[PDB]
Amino acid sequence: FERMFKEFFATPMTGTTMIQSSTGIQISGKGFMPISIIEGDQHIKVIAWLPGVNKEDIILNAVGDTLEIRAKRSPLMITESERIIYSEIPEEEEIYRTIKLPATVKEENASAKFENGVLSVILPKAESSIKKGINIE
Amino acid sequence: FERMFKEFFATPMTGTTMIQSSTGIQISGKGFMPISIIEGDQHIKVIAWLPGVNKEDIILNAVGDTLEIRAKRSPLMITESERIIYSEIPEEEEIYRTIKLPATVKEENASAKFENGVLSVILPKAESSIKKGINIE
Amino acid sequence: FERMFKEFFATPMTGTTMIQSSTGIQISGKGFMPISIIEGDQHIKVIAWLPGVNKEDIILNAVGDTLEIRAKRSPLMITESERIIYSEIPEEEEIYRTIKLPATVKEENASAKFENGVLSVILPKAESSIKKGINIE
Amino acid sequence: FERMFKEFFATPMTGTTMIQSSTGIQISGKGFMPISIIEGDQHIKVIAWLPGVNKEDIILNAVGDTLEIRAKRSPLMITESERIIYSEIPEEEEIYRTIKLPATVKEENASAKFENGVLSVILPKAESSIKKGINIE
Amino acid sequence: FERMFKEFFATPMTGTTMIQSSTGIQISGKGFMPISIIEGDQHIKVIAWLPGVNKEDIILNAVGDTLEIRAKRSPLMITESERIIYSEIPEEEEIYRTIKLPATVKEENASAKFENGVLSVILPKAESSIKKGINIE
Amino acid sequence: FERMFKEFFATPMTGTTMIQSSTGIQISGKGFMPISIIEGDQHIKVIAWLPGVNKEDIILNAVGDTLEIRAKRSPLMITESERIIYSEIPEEEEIYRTIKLPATVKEENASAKFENGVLSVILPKAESSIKKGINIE
Amino acid sequence: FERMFKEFFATPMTGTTMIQSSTGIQISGKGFMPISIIEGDQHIKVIAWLPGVNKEDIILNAVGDTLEIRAKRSPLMITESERIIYSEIPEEEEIYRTIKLPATVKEENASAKFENGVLSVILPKAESSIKKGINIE
Amino acid sequence: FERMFKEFFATPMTGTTMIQSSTGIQISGKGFMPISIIEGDQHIKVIAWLPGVNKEDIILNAVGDTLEIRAKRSPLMITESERIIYSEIPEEEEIYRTIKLPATVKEENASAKFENGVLSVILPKAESSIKKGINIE
Amino acid sequence: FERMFKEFFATPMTGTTMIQSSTGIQISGKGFMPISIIEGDQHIKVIAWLPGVNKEDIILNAVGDTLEIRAKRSPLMITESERIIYSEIPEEEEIYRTIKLPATVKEENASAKFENGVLSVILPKAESSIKKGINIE
Amino acid sequence: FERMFKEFFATPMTGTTMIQSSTGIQISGKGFMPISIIEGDQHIKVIAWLPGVNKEDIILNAVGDTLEIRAKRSPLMITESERIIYSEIPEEEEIYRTIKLPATVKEENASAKFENGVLSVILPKAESSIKKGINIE
Amino acid sequence: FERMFKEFFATPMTGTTMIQSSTGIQISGKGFMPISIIEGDQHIKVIAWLPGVNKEDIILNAVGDTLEIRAKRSPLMITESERIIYSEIPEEEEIYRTIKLPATVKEENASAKFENGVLSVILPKAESSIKKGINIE
Amino acid sequence: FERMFKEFFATPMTGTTMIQSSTGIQISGKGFMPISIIEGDQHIKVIAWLPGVNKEDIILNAVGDTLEIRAKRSPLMITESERIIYSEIPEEEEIYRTIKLPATVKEENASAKFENGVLSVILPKAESSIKKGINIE
Amino acid sequence: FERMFKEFFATPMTGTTMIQSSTGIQISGKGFMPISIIEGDQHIKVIAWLPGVNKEDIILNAVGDTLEIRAKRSPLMITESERIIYSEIPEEEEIYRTIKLPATVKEENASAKFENGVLSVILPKAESSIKKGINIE
Amino acid sequence: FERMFKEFFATPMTGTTMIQSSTGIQISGKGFMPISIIEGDQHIKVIAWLPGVNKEDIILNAVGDTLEIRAKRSPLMITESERIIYSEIPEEEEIYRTIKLPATVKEENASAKFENGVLSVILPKAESSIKKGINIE
């Protein structure tokens, strides 16, 4: 029966809940919010796909090594004469993600941008998390 | 093994190709582009999620009862010191959808909007596709 | 587990959605609306079971070879002292069917009747769809 | 093979026989007759879907805690030139249900209504079945 | 292996024990005794197949809503020179059925007939089990 | 699913068709007619259960080593107020069996009796089929 | 794995709980107490195996059509030097059975005997449960 | 897949609906309401776990051998800044149980107590349900 | 199918044959005779459940390390008007057990008691089987 | 066999042990104690269902990010004449939960309430765990 | 489970019934009677193992191409003090075989011998069954 | 495939090897030799089926509690014109059984008889194996 | 499911019961007591792991070729404030093993030592069990 | 095949490796070392079964919330004439466990005892890990 579901390609709606994820990072939350974490030597970049989310509806909070992205996307309004005959876009309104980063960040120096429904957050690493170089001999 | 994949929640990347779909409409294409089709009495509304797509990279063409949405999203640029440690965002660049609508539209009067990565296309129905009312006695 | 469900006889509610049907005709829609299509030489008869639907809540529109039946049945009102201890009647309110007929009809001459919750629609065939007789020798 | 049948959505015809049902009530009979039983403090409401049943063809009898609904729906008449190319409406003519209610009713005060193919029967509970209130201290 | 048994058609002997049966009625007993229960408005008819049972060996007793049919069929006598090379007729001698009727009967007015090995019992319903008619408005 | 059917004990109706049977004898036919064949040194006894069959409706013909039993049992007549709520008795009217005996019989000297729905046929063996005794030394 | 348990023959201990039993009678209880119910025309005999139960520890109560047998068997006392190397006798102390008889009994005239660990209870049937004889014509 | 659910320990929410239960008693209802029935010689004690139910929201009614417990627990109120990150407590508001007791009770003498979310109902048995003692000889 | 049998709780009859048992002891025999062997330092106690066995029908013989318990329980006598409608008590008459004890016993000093259908046999151990104590240093 | 257990709805007793749980929080313990954790910006609310637990038997201790709830519920006392014929309430007495919260709390300012068997604990977050706001540009 | 039976080597008893056999010959019967058929140019030799059969209890009859061997072996008599602790010898008394030979025999010239429980029957072939020689060129 | 072999009834040949058997006795050997062991109070009777074995070819030796039966049956001699078209009789010549009796026998007083291919051996038990009687009080 | 248990490594508790063991030796008993048997030419060494067993609680008895090790380990005492959050040590108190040695020992010359919870027993072999040397030529 | 291994009871050797364990604690290591962790309000007790380990071979180190138990048990020495015929005691010499405790301990105040092969370690909790009491109102 899983193949029958794979034939439906119903992955944005039934998929992407991400109750848990374990890859050295802890990602938890509700809804559809693809995350990309790019780790640098001095900072961490978090890319979140928030399509149809207004900038004023994004609550972006961080502390230590945890980042919380809370957003609400207003559902597709339809007139009484109109009807949704086909839809793959998830209907869930309130979507959120709690990302436990592997390094401590300086949340007072973090910055974020919202373009084309793409949230890009820059989180500078704390001095206690910046790695030193082991010379090889 | 399908359950093991379901436990990964890898639905945006491995999922959403939509080679074919049959619900009275024909949707074909490549990549991740959730579509919502709202049918009215005088028009059709197509909602396409194009997160991280610039407005200048959207080619929107229609004729008769077929709509083609072609878009390219530039991949996530990373500096040499930076590395993608975790990513759920599909890497595919060129994404497109061919939607065969159930009604003929007047493409000369169609309009589209691109906000928050959401493409909303208004396609007025042709007079030959506007349904009349059968009085009930 | 499918046998366990068959033992419940839960077919009006869980069943009858009819996302799609392929028998030379295309039937799509939402809800419970059994359809019977009787094809004649000069017309098409569509029998729709709309139990508990008022005549004023039936929107019957047709064009070319497509028939749309939209109806809303008010749910079973219950007083606060009353409780639904057992129910097999589907709770869905808005039910609709899009029937793609195999012949073009003259929607301007169509007629419909609503008796005992049975919608009977008469759709005269267009002259371009009336078949001629091939003499056999 | 049960999934193949589920893909046919053949639930009104092959389904709904209801040879037996056990939920504190006993429902037996032949044919398609969705039942909804709403239990109040002073009465019982039985909602029966009898689409295409004429009011004169409904035999409604009750005694004690048992209700019998017997009805016959004339089949879809078709002219010799006409043919049933598609049909989901059950062909069975004589349909009946024997409902064993959980409370004794006063059948001499019962009433029934038949609107839009919906049989609504009001069965007042007998004084021996009206429950008293246990004060909580 | 059940198919192998189905290929033997060994249903009169291995089959028909009827330890229990639940269809709003309770039928219990031992042996082969097909029962048919026809329910009328004023009486109940019980048809029992007692092939090779003599009328003097039938014990027919009833009370309230329970009917007991006890019968013994003498086995097929065979001379010492004769041998049963093939036989599908059940060898069990003492056969009985306890039928719990759904209505109370007046056993003092019951009658029975035994023709061609067919026991037909007429059980008039008690006044407390005769259903009244609910007028429909 | 075969166990589910075994739990129904539906053996007289669904069972007993006996399309074929191979035990040195060939039994073919339609319907429910349990056969018992007792072979003697000078004759063959055929016991057929024809419950509810009238003696005038039994056509008993034989030749060589083949016996044909054709019978029709009138179905259970029910008044319009009466209804068959439960029935295990097969509804098939015309029942017949073709029994290929292992020995040639003298059909001109055969006799049959019909008591309690039990057909007992005596078929004297032909002189060419009477076995002689091999003395043992 | 059920065969492995069958190979252990662990039926007195793991078996015989009898949470429920449905054969026209309702038997419920806890522990090992084989029951045999013999039904006569004027009485019911209940045979209960209470091995190692003293007569003073049997509580035998009945009313209407329900019989309750409550008994406690003192466990096998063992001296400190002794040890149970092998045992198939159930260790449960308090054993009880609630038997719902199919006929109403006159509990004021019931009698019971306890010999060799066998409880034999005689329950005279009530006049309302004594069946009359239907003459056959 | 059932083991995967067992690993979630999701038993209060997905579990405890109790559509039906058969142990000589009939328990029906909706929601989570663990029941304990203690049967005495003169009364029946019903223990119902109604955690977070106020005493004024418990409707306790009984008659004959049936007890109905209807209760509504207000859901967990959360401020807009607060969010339910984890929850095992069932969200269902209206919970009810219909318990068919095995003995008739005197509902006019019943009493109930509500402490620590534990409903303890005392139901004295009717004189017709008090069992007598069968002397053993 | 083993679960279906487990649901019948048919363990006293179908179970308890004990063709063989291997736990350092050899128990063989026919019928239902639960055995408990308690081993002491100076003797062996054998507890045998012989419900409904008269003391005069028990043949108790032993030699060396083997004990034979042979008993016959007269079956449940039933009058012609009475019938066994339900029975869990094994019908087997002659029951026996051959127990190979792990120690040699002095059969000339053995004793047995028969109370409440419980056979308790005391078998003093032979001097060659009494174990000595190994001092630990 | 898991479906057979699901049909028993035995979830409060066999279920709810919660040996472990991983959702960014660690919940460990013994017994039935549904937990709901509501996370705010300045505090954490823990809702624990302790039905039939007295307030004096609740030991509530916390430190850092770990909360321990230890409680003992006295079992259902039953008189010797009374017996538990049916019970779904878990018999376990000592129940406890160790909840590892995702944020550090100020245990010196925590408060708890116990109403209707519902433990509501308010745990103010430590200043080191209060998240700051990342302005979006 | 078939391997478990193969491990018992229970082939003389459970095996050797030979309901049917098809190898150009037809062998039918009841019981254990190993047959060996040796075909010559002028006769047929039938070897039947009738261990413990007395010569006076063998009925040997033949005609045409069919041979019937009927025999009864008296069961193993045991004194009351003696008991069958182990037995592999089939207990069935009356054993018989009907062998349809491939050639017609002259039963008037047949002979048989009974030594060591071995029945050796000599059946001369009829002139109509003696094959001629086709010269090869 | 085991059923296919069961359909062949090839049990005398492929079956009856008896490599081992464990029922408190040890039976080992080669070939087909059904054994029946009847144990008395003073002796043991061994019944061995040696069909087609001459008395001079039986080697019968015993000691202590072990009995060895060695026999050779000459194969079925066939003339060159004759051929074995069908045979169920095992072809193995040398057959033997080693039976470990459960009691020591006095081999100097044993006797044997050979009639109809049935070897009956009488083995008197040794005084050390004759069991004494444990009086029951 | 066995793999799930293997993943728990629950072998000291659920494992090590050793109901039986067959390797030319017979080991029986209850509890966790790993045994090592080292066989020499003149003696047998038995190594038993009795961790947490006091020397005064070990009962070591032997005779012939059987050794019995009986020991009781007091459970882990815990103060009321303390709780067992994790434990792999078996809770069973009374543990015992019956080891049937392959050689007869002189129990009067046996010795045992108890160090670090390791019981080492020296059992000199009896002269009747000391093997001689077969010279090879 | 896992059942075959379960029948061997090979749990001390093949089992108890404990590569990992997750119950809020992390236990890692090599070999057989059953651990019991008892958590108090002021300390943690670790019980380790080190049978046959000398006190001088135990390396017990702790820091923060991690405890390391390293031990080596000398293998069972055997003389050249002696041979290990049977052994269940694990042969592994070097055994170790790393236990990550849930609370920080004051390793400078820890103490340990080694009696009967039982290592009992007392680890006082650090002041930062001692939980305070939340008053309930």
UniProtKB/Swiss-Prot annotation, chains A, B, C, D, E, F, G, H, I, J, K, L, M, N:
Any one GO CC term of the record: protein-containing complex
GO MF terms held by the record: identical protein binding; protein folding chaperone; unfolded protein binding
Domain sHSP: 26-137
Keywords recorded for this protein, A-Z: Chaperone, Cytoplasm, Stress response
Family according to the record: Belongs to the small heat shock protein (HSP20) family.
Known partners and oligomeric status: Homooligomer of 24 subunits. Forms a spherical shape.
Chain's role: Chaperone that confers thermal protection to other proteins.
The protein's name in its UniProt record: Small heat shock protein HSP16.5
Species for this entry: Methanocaldococcus jannaschii (strain ATCC 43067 / DSM 2661 / JAL-1 / JCM 10045 / NBRC 100440)
